């Protein structure tokens, strides 16, 4: 069906972000506009970064 949504992550990095420097983690499922999975991290310093799925540190986070 018709999707008015595009892929948000123009850039992506595997950089580990420690828990205490994060405000929000949002997982954006595949399809619905973007064919790949998106993980948007809102840091406390106000910078917003994208981490790719199946990356060493976020892979264990998917369990819960």
């Amino acid at each position, epitope marked *: 069906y018709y999707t008015s949504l595009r892929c948000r992550c123009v850039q992506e990095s595997s950089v*580990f972000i*420690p*828990r*205490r*420097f*994060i*405000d*929000r*983690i*949002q*997982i954006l499922p595949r399809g619905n506009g973007c064919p790949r999975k998106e993980i948007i991290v809102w840091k*406390k*310093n106000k910078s917003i970064v994208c981490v790719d799925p199946q990356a060493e*540190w976020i892979q*264990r*986070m998917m369990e*819960v």
Partner: antibody, heavy 125, light 109 residues
């Protein structure tokens, strides 16, 4: 309503190593820190562990002595304090750094919501 | 080092009191990651405030938190006898650690 149960009060010699356990009631272990409390004194953060992020960090004055481990199968966090001395006589607490999770996302909390009962450590003297 | 708080505060009942917590740019002045704790003698601490002003469920709204620069504060409105306790502020640091305040003994006369 989840609570943290720590190991009983131990009496050890100077130079020895004390391992204090901290179990979470449920099913899996979360972010756990360790806070020392000397008699009549203030609270002192020694270190912590994030089993979810696979990281453990300690305070400069406790670095090289204290060892924090977490077993996700038995949901137990450990506090290993090597080369004990007189000033180490304190009440040792384990505390959880809570995490919030919903449809909008994962929100970590940089605070200590639930605490353990406390493990009194007395050194000889 | 540690977060600076007065050793003790004395006040009459039903009177609001503010407890200061002075840190540095690497902790209190970095982000809103500042917490407050009530500790009754011999008992494990109880989280009163998380973030700067956020109270968890079950905590009275008489306890309110604030922050401006390197200084954080805890206001206890309509002070009761049961409020008689020790109060610690805490803050996470840029070193990926936590730092506790010296502690404030509150007394009701």
């Amino acid at each position: 309503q989840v609570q943290l149960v720590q190991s009983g009060a131990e009496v050890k010699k100077p130079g020895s190593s004390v391992k204090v356990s901290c179990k979470a009631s449920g099913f899996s272990s979360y972010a756990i820190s360790w806070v020392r409390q000397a008699p009549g004194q203030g609270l002192e953060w020694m270190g912590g562990i994030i089993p979810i992020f696979g990281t453990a960090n300690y305070a400069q004055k406790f670095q090289g002595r204290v060892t924090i481990t977490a077993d996700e199968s038995t949901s137990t966090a450990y506090m290993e304090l090597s080369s004990l001395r007189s000033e180490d006589t304190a009440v040792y607490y384990c505390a959880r750094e809570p995490d919030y999770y919903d449809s909008s996302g994962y929100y970590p909390i940089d605070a200590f919501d639930i605490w353990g009962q406390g493990t009194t450590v007395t050194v000889s003297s | 080092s540690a977060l600076t708080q007065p050793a003790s505060v004395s006040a009459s009942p039903g009177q609001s009191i503010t407890i200061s917590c002075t840190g540095t740019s690497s902790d209190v002045g970095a982000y809103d990651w500042v917490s407050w704790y009530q500790q009754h003698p011999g008992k494990a601490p109880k989280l009163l405030i998380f973030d700067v002003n956020n109270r968890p469920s079950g905590v009275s709204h008489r306890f309110s938190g604030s922050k401006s620069g390197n200084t954080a504060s805890l206001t206890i409105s309509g002070l009761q006898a049961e409020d008689e306790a020790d109060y610690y502020c805490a803050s996470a640091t840029l070193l990926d650690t936590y730092v506790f305040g010296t502690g404030t003994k509150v007394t009701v006369l």
